[PDB]
């Protein structure tokens, strides 16, 4: 929003860049930070860990009722079956959208998000506009921001991740996908459908 007090984005970026390089130089001299360590972190979350991993769980649950049971009882242990887990998803609890219940996830106090299945959160998830309003007016927020209308009679459950427990939405399988392959169904599973701000893709 407009703030007559705020420098330009370019002036802000220039300042942050200098400050970060200066801090980086100091930690390098302390022997605790290296360029290879920076590169590895960035490679993992740019190309290795992403919402494609969460979609694999979702499509397995959609096509394997026994796995779905296990996923809903202990999410960390279930995802471990597919080789998925680790940092910031050590404790994972999956919640299933149904005809009566819609789930949406938030972290009002900061930014908590299930990295092993979704990768790093998009900036809007971490920012104050989404975090402040979704606990208070979830139904309106979903319709205005994401064009997602949830019927008044359907209950919306907002999960505020105040702990190290991580909540992940299992979206409902779209109609019209009988007998689809696991690859074919994954194209319908979006980051947004596992946060609960959108359904899985139609058609």
């Amino acid at each position: 929003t407009e703030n007559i007090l705020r420098k330009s984005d370019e002036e802000i970026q220039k300042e942050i860049t200098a400050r970060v390089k200066a801090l980086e130089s100091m930690l390098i001299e302390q022997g605790i930070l290296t360029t290879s360590m920076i590169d590895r972190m960035a490679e993992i979350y740019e190309n290795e860990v992403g919402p494609h991993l969460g979609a694999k769980v979702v499509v397995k649950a959609w096509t394997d009722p026994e796995f779905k049971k296990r996923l809903l009882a202990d999410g960390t242990e279930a995802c471990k079956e597919l080789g998925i887990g680790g940092l910031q998803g050590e404790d994972m609890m999956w919640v299933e959208n149904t005809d009566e219940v819609h789930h949406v996830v938030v972290c009002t106090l900061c930014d908590c998000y299930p990295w092993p299945v979704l990768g790093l959160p998009p900036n809007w998830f971490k920012e104050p506009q989404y975090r402040s309003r979704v606990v208070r007016e979830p139904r309106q927020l979903l319709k205005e921001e994401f064009g997602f209308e949830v019927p008044p009679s359907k209950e919306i459950k907002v999960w505020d991740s105040s702990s190290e427990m991580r909540f992940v939405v299992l979206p409902q399988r779209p109609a019209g996908t009988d007998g689809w392959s696991e690859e074919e169904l994954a194209t319908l599973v979006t980051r947004e459908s596992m946060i609960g701000v959108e359904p899985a893709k139609a058609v």
Partner: protein
């Protein structure tokens, strides 16, 4: 902390800004800020709970409008000074150096295989916060509980919108690192963890959706029994 970061239920913050797409890292400096998290963790700057508390102590106007990873920089500096590992005057002098010489080289250093091993191990093994305790859980599913009205000045996970409110225990997860000690440098002191359901009307009065509930995670000391 009764900080501005505790934004749940706040009005007037603006519509969501959500580009149709955006890269994982918007600038090189963001990769650096991200990677400094495992680096300062390993070096003893702070743990996860202290990390968050550092951000909670930011100037609120800066917190509200700065790039997310700038928050991380702020908390690294906060704890670097706190522990004496970072000298602020040197840092300010180097900032001005890189303002004037943005392309100057970084210090010469050796690469460390153990830092790569640490990265991979943390990413794929995780940093689990669950802990075993000798005491059994005080609460159980179906219990009606009320959330504490205490308002500590140190770190805690007591969003203001849930304080003094009544809800029903949904699940006990086991015991976990307790923020109220961990984030304040007082150790893990683990406590049983529960998810608790609060109806929107309980939370927001008549302005609440009659068909919506908020699920919130409470460590045992946060909640006291109403109806078993």
């Amino acid at each position: 902390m009764n900080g501005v970061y505790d934004v749940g239920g706040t009005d007037g913050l603006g519509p969501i800004n959500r580009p149709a797409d955006e890269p994982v890292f918007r600038a090189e400096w963001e990769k650096v800020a991200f990677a400094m998290f495992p680096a300062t963790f390993r070096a003893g700057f702070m743990g996860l709970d202290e990390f968050r508390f550092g951000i909670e102590q930011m100037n609120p106007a800066e917190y509200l409008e700065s790039p997310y990873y700038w928050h991380w920089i702020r908390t690294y500096i906060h704890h670097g000074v706190r522990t004496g590992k970072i000298d602020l005057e040197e840092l300010e002098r180097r900032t001005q150096y890189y303002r004037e010489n943005p392309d100057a080289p970084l210090p010469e250093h050796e690469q460390k295989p153990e830092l790569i091993e640490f990265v991979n191990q943390a990413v794929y093994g995780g940093l689990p916060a669950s802990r075993e305790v000798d005491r059994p859980p005080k609460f159980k599913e179906g219990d009606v509980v009320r959330f504490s009205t205490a308002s500590p000045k140190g770190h805690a996970r007591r969003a203001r919108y849930v304080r003094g409110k009544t809800g029903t225990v949904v699940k006990h997860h086991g015991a976990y690192i307790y923020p109220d000690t961990a984030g304040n440098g007082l150790g893990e002191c683990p406590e049983h963890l529960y998810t608790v359901r609060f109806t929107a009307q309980e939370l927001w009065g008549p302005e609440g959706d009659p068909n919506s509930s908020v699920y919130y995670d409470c460590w045992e000391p946060y909640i006291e029994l109403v109806d078993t």
